[PDB]
Structures are given as C-alpha cells and as structure tokens.
C-alpha cells in the first residue's frame, strides 16, 4: 500500500484532539492523512493533508522525531504529533466534497477499540463512528504519558 501521512493535532491542554469526518467508505471520524505523491517527503505530505482537510497549516508546528505510526493491512500510516494548537482556531477544508466536518474530540472519552458483540453471541465487532481513529488513541495516550506526564 501507498504510505500515509497526516498529524495528531492537540490543543493547549492535551485534552482534546482534532478529528475529521468524510464521506462514504471514509464516512466516520478520523485524523486528517493522505497517500504520500511520487517523491514527495513525509513531512510534506502530511502538510499537504492536513491543510487540504483542514485549512490548517503544520508545516512551522512538525517536529521530525514526534509521531506515531502504524502499519495496519500492510499500509503503513504515520501521523505527526502537533500539541498546542488553540481550541478557536478556525478549521475549514479545502473541499467540502471530501471533509463533512472538523471537530475537537475528548481523548479520554474516545475509545481505544472497538467493543464485541459478545451480548448477542455473534462474532466480529460493532460499528463505530471512531474506526479509522482507533489504532491510535492507546499509542497517543502512551506517547502523551511519557512525552509530558
Ligand atoms: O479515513 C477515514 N476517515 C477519516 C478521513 C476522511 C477523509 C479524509 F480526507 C481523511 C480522513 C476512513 C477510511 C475508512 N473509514 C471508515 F470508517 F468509514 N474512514
């Protein structure tokens, strides 16, 4: 797969990060990423995303050795952790024909997997507005831990 690239962007007190939400097979939550183009750097690319998603630009905000990432169905997706970013800050995408909304999510009150349905004796798990965002949130809460504590 095609490596992606985008940020996890926090606000001032390490509460809340910024989620996206798109439309269809990307109808959920989730950071703000995208396929890296032919020759283009990581660093770039995820300005690139973040700022056709969110009108917000990273690229003064990135440090190189801040970011998590994960290989999921061997495509490997690595966002870049950007702290501090004020909650009034005015998000808006480049086309609304990709990004539904933009909000501010509590990272405490996220979830960090999706949950069974072992209540009904069925396999597999529930649906979850939060899929795409999930891999990440244990390994943020993680990176936040030692990083700040
Ligand atoms: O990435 C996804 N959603 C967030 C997003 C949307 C638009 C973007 F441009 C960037 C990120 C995604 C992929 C599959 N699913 C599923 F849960 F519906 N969500």
Redesign the pocket.
Known sequence: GVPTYGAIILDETLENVLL???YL??????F???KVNKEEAPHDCAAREVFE?TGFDIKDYICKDDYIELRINDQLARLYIIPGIPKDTKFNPKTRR??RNIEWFSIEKLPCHRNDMTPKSKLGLAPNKF??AIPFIRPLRDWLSRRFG
């Open positions: 996206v939400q798109g097979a990307k109808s959920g939550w989730g703000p990423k995208g998603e990709e990004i899929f795409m």
